Design a protein around this ligand. Structure first.
Ligand SMILES: O=c1ccn([C@@H]2O[C@H](COP(=O)(O)OP(=O)(O)O)[C@@H](O)[C@H]2O)c(=O)[nH]1
Ligand SMILES: [Mg+2]
Ligand SMILES: [Mg+2]
Length: 351
């Protein structure tokens, strides 16, 4: 029994990049389940074996982490091409880990054929024909299916909370009390504006000391539908393995998501935030039933309520520590279900 896990569109080496980090973390959580797993990437490394040195059909299961397959500048991207070539030769079912609604499985050949460098690859080499099982982070399978409406071989769909992987690591640990330097914090990309309204509502013109880290930059917020006067401070990107420590610098950390994420996705940030020393404040619309934490104090409906809640935490250290204790307790209640989680994952990949 040998399992192979690959990232469909990014090179995997270490924790210097987010997609590489995510693949390594998934590799780790699967391995810790008592399974033999290899990460296959462009070259052999501390965490990987090269695509060329192995033979895909020697593996009993092929797991693929979702990614975009867009070629920038219309130039070749070996991570994408080699991953799909690897997938194309596999003769069994492919398990696609669908954690980002915007990254559904897609065929690269259709884009390659019209390229001047098309002569470098053949349809036979890149067209993936094996049946595929999409393992959806989102519970709503129709949304997942709508996202894959163009593919002809994506046959199955099954929900599984993939991004709980950070809390189930053998080396997982809650963040410790941290000196506060910010009132509110949020880390992420601009996600092509798929969440601009919420970002402006909760992070702009608040009068609070707010920091926005990650790939997002102030100049990206220019939609006339969502005006603002004073923006939060944009500090740049940090390694994925440092996100909880970063969140911990603030009194509170914001939870928001894409339209299709509301009452559907429980993203990685939910856990990175819950496990941090920052009080988790959730956009009401993101979890209307309060399923993450059955305590309305952790939820905010708009800018005004966010401002009120944050001030409350600033004027009462005891309230802040109470809420942190509660989210830490809730996080642990989910960790106590690791066995179930592991068995659910194994079943998801037909083991
Ligand atoms: O500087 C940063 C900012 C974000 N992240 C990671 O990127 C995720 C955010 O991804 P995205 O912006 O797509 O938001 P999501 O849709 O995950 O909420 C975080 O949870 C982190 O794991 C990171 O590693 N470094
Ligand atoms: Mg994610
Ligand atoms: Mg309220």
């Amino acid at each position: 029994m040998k399992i192979a896990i690959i990232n469909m569109g990014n090179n995997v080496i270490n924790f210097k990049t987010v997609p590489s980090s995510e693949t390594i973390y998934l590799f780790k959580v699967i391995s810790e389940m008592g399974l033999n797993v290899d990460i296959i990437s462009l070259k052999n490394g501390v965490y990987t074996k090269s695509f060329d040195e192995v033979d895909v059909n020697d593996y009993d299961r092929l797991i693929v982490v979702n990614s975009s397959i867009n070629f920038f500048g219309g130039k070749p991207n070996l991570a994408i091409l080699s991953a799909q070539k690897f997938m194309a030769k596999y003769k069994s079912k492919i398990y696609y880990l669908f954690t980002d609604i915007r990254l559904p499985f897609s065929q690269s050949w259709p884009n390659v054929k019209n390229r001047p460098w098309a002569y470098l690859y053949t349809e036979e080499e890149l067209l993936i024909k094996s049946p595929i099982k999409v393992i959806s982070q989102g519970i709503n399978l129709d949304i997942a299916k709508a996202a894959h409406k163009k593919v002809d071989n994506v046959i199955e769909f099954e929900y599984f909370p993939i991004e709980q992987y950070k809390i189930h690591m053998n080396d997982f640990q809650l963040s410790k009390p941290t000196k506060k330097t910010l009132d509110v914090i949020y880390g992420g990309s601009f996600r092509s504006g798929q969440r601009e309204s919420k970002m402006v509502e909760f992070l702009f013109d608040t009068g609070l000391n707010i920091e926005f880290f990650g790939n997002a930059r102030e100049k990206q917020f220019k939609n006339p539908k969502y005006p603002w006067t004073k923006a939060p401070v944009f500090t740049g990107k940090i390694p994925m393995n440092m996100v909880s420590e970063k969140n911990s610098q603030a009194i509170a950390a914001l939870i928001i998501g894409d339209k299709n994420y509301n009452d559907n996705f429980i993203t990685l940030r939910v856990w990175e935030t819950m496990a941090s020393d920052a009080v988790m404040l959730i956009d009401e619309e993101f979890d209307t039933k309060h399923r993450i934490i059955n305590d309305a104090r952790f939820y905010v409906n708009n800018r005004a309520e966010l401002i009120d809640r944050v001030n409350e935490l600033k004027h009462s250290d005891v309230l802040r520590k109470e809420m942190l204790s509660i989210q830490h307790d809730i996080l642990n209640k989910t960790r106590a279900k690791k066995a179930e989680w592991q068995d659910a994952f194994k079943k998801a990949i037909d083991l």
